[PDB]
Amino acid sequence: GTGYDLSNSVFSPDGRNFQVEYAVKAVENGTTSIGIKCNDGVVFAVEKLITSKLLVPQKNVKIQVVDRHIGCVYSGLIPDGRHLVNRGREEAASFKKLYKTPIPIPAFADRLGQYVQAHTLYNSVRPFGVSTIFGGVDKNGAHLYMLEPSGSYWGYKGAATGKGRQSAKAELEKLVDHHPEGLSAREAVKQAAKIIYLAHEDNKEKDFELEISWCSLSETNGLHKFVKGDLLQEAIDFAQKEIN
Amino acid sequence: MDIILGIRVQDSVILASSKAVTRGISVLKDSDDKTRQLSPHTLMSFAGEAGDTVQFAEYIQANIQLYSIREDYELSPQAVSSFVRQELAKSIRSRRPYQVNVLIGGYDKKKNKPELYQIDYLGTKVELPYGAHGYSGFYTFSLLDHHYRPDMTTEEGLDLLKLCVQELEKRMPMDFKGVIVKIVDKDGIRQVDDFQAQ
């Protein structure tokens, strides 16, 4: 019959979970955000629509840090995103407390993964309405990941989600082909600013604000930090130039 | 301790209980009735710890009366004493055990015979022709072992008690301020208001 999409943990006759797929709709409807993995770290960037002049510039920070070496950005229901980061922070704290060592990015990924997957197992909960891009530097290098409402996640060279996910992916694939030797943290930052500017066309109606953060072994000492001031404006200029 | 005596004669059970209530250096009351009627033909006397005593007697009274209303029937004295022993036996291994000893005197209307049960705070129950809790037993058991007969009349029983009370007023250390005597028989429970000189 029908009605296989009214309750969460339900399998449709073709083996799908519609509630999860509907969650994806909330994600695709969101702001575009990306992740670029450079040769010794990762760069995060996101689109901040300016609903009105009333929003204080530089004030509603989207990117979030977990512990001191991990960065998180997501598209969709912001509140759902914060909720997931809170779980990540507890998750990272519990790992460190027992094993002493700050949580390895791969282990962190599965921690978020099992949690998000858990929200597709019962009808008493709703799946997460966000796709999240996160990563950092650990004992064995840099790692970039993207997690879907289904709980699915994999490691990426470049990742994008949201409204302009297609432009971004197109651009990220270009970078990959033109840089088999790797991209540097400095370059990833500029390129990130560009990809966001380009992907902003699928929303060219409202004006936006750029936000970038990065975690690089050589640039930030493996710690997660926001790209501010001159390095930021410099990236904005590099984008504003190639947008024309 | 306080005096708690019970003696079962031919057709009734007689309970005598000291009237004194002493706290430390002062006797606070001299007319205290250490008894609760559990049902029209079942009377219970008690002695022990300052608060547990009444809390336990009343708790049981409430339960027996509740049983009476629900079943519109009066439990036999044997059944009541068993319920009481069970409650004390639970108590002994609880966090704060009831420190109460009791005598249960009842008239079994079905068997038409009086019954006397002695039960201590440990849940030790025994049926006897006569019993006592506390130090009284040390003077009254051999007394009654001498002057007691099964077929005695209620009047004979009261004289048997007078004999016990006198011995207690002569040899016991404390001034228990006399006793209150009650009789349980086929017609219920009544108090012998004239024993202060019977």
């Binding site: 449709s12 083996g15 997957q117 289904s150 699915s152 996640y153 | -």
Partner: protein, 243 residues
């Protein structure tokens, strides 16, 4: 009344649609896997299809190391796949701690199978849309293949296959055994058994593979490990010099 199709209760036919639909989800990944037993090793092969160029191929896998000796290959979506893997690892570590010896492959299978049986009887738990193939060289039973489905069913196999083209691979293997008359690959080295597996995978599916089209796991006495793109390449080159 028409809800006997949304949770795990019986339909008038005595069926459990949610369990059936779960089985359906197992093919979602469009990948086939197969396992065979050697003289004293066990091999599992699984297709690997990493389409997106933005992905890091090294982080994509449906094969798991549950314990020093147990390997698990999963046919089904990765999130349910990982939920199952984490559970099995937990079950494996606990068993060792409580009973003093390594959990046998068949015992872990029964335990995971029982767990699945529960999602089949309790309403608030949904079945996992995955089929689990566990392998090892048991200290008591030798090479072992045990597979469990969303119905809480499991059994031991001489060899087995799972995925969209399961039937093709199964009959192929069936035939080879009807021929050899033995219930295993009479080969001493695991490399040759891995080669046998990939060879018959190619025959049954009618397709050629590159080092990045497969995923391989091997179980030997006291150790289960996965092969690297290169280990595989070396394996592929070998089958090439026979055809």
């Amino acid at each position: 009344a028409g809800y006997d199709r949304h949770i795990t209760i019986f339909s008038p036919e005595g069926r459990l649609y949610q369990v059936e639909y779960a089985f359906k989800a197992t093919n979602q990944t469009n990948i086939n896997s197969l396992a065979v037993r050697g003289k004293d090793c066990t091999v599992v092969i699984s297709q690997k299809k990493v389409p997106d160029k933005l992905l890091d191929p090294t982080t994509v896998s449906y094969i798991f190391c549950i314990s020093r000796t147990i390997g698990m290959v999963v046919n089904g979506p990765i999130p349910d796949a990982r939920n199952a893997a984490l559970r099995a690892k937990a079950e494996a570590a606990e068993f060792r701690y409580k009973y003093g010896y390594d959990m046998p492959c068949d015992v872990l299978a029964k335990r995971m199978a029982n767990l699945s049986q529960i999602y089949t009887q309790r309403a608030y738990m949904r079945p996992l849309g995955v089929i689990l193939t566990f392998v090892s060289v048991d200290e008591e039973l030798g090479p072992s293949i045990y597979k469990t489905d969303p119905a809480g069913y499991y059994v031991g196999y001489k060899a087995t296959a799972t995925g969209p083209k399961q039937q093709e691979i199964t009959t192929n293997l069936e035939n080879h055994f009807k021929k050899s008359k033995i219930d295993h690959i009479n080969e001493e080295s695991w490399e040759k058994v891995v080669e046998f597996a990939i060879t018959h995978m190619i025959d049954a599916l009618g397709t050629e593979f590159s080092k990045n089209d497969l995923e391989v796991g091997v179980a030997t006495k006291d150790k289960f490990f996965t092969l690297s793109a290169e280990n595989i390449e070396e394996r592929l080159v070998a089958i090439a010099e026979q055809d």
